[PDB]
Each structure stands twice: as C-alpha cells, then as structure tokens.
C-alpha cells in the first residue's frame, strides 16, 4: 500500500496514499513530473533555480511527494494541506526523513485561510495538480497573493484534463490568475526525459510588477 519514487541517485521516496479513517490522497501523476523535475540541473547549484537551503511552501501537497523531493535536495520545506491530510503527510515524513538533507514540516493550509505567517516570503511555493477544483481556485489565488513576494518563484504542475467541466475550470484558473501574476509555460523538453507528458504542464508564476 506504497506508492514508490525512484531518485536519479537511486534512492527511493515511499508514499502511503491511505490515512485510517477514510481521510486519503494518491499519488497524482502531476507529483511525479514536478518532482522528478525538480531534479533536473535547473535546481542544482550550477542551475538557475538552487533549491538547497531555500524555502520551500507547498499547497495541496496530498501525500507530501513534491515537498519531500525538494527536502531530498536541501530545501526547508512545509508541506501543507487540509486537516484531514495531516496524519498521512506526517506518515510520509517519517518513511522518509532519512532521505531528507533540508529540512520539512507540516502544516495545516486551507485555501483562502491565512495561517501562521513565514518571517519573509519563501522562495519557492510549489503545487501539483491544484488547478481542477473549481470551487476553491479564488481562496487559491488568495493565498499565492498572500503568501508570495515579487521575489518568490511559483511553480505550478497540472496534468491537463480534456473532457467534460475541465476546460472551462482551466480557463477560469488562468483568467484570476493575469489579474495579480505573470506566467510562462515550461517547455516539455526540459522536464524529465522518461517523466513527462504533453498533457501535464509546467508553468512558472510571478507576482506581477510592471513599470508601466
Ligand atoms: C489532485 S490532489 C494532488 C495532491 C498532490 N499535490 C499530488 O499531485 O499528488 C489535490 C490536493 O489539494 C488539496 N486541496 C483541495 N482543496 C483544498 C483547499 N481548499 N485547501 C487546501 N488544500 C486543498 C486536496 O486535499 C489534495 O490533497
């Protein structure tokens, strides 16, 4: 009942997706492709994008996959989520920690919830598959604005969804998100040779500052 994450180093991440009492989250194919990544040469420390001793908040982290990766690789990491998801994000720090070379906590984050604040912006906020939840993307975007600085790089992960409501939630997400944040998509040949799809994209945030 382990989901399993193979590192490029030969390491592997351990991730149970059931939490007692009904409360759980799987493994999303989105967490795969962004944490694998965040093991490309973009985040080591000849690349433009050094995780190791920065910090580190992640939303919706579920089982905790993508924030556990960014510990694996030097980064402070919070994993963060609903109440119910603590239990299981907490399981998956212990089967893990002995990889961890940063550092990693979790914390209760619901969106739209202002929450125990960082002592200056992270410099990372990461999410993985968070777009397709129509009712929480406004309380989503309330927390990037709140949380982020001009400074904080958002990466964003989503695995697009074709049919049915999902093509109008995607636009809906984006059309809230120009009015306080740039982006700019991540182009498939820099992803994971073996973990990648042209359904699941890569896009960089930026809190907006124009001079004009
Ligand atoms: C599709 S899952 C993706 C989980 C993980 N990031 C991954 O890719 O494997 C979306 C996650 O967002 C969380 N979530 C949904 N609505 C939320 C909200 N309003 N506030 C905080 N977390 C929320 C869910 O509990 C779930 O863990």
Sequence with gaps: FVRVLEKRDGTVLRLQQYSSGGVGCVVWDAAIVLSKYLETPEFSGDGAH??????????????????????????????????????????????????????????????????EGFPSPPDFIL???????????????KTLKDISGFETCII?????????????????????????????????????????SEDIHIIYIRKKKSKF
């Design 156 to 196: 964003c992960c989503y695995e697009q969804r074709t049919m049915g409501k999902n093509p109008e939630i995607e636009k809906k997400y984006f059309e809230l998100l120009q009015l306080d944040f740039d982006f700019e998509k991540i182009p498939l040949e820099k992803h994971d040779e073996e973990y990648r």
């Design 127 to 141: 999410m993985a598959d968070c777009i397709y939840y129509e009712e929480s993307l406004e309380p989503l975007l």
């Design 50 to 115: 050094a995780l190791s001793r920065r910090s580190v908040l992640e939303l919706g982290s579920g089982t905790g996959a993508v924030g556990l990766m960014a510990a694996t690789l030097g980064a402070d990491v919070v994993v963060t989520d609903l109440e119910e998801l603590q239990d299981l994000l907490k399981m998956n720090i212990n089967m893990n920690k002995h990889l961890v070379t940063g550092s990693v906590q979790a914390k209760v984050l619901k969106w739209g919830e202002e929450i």
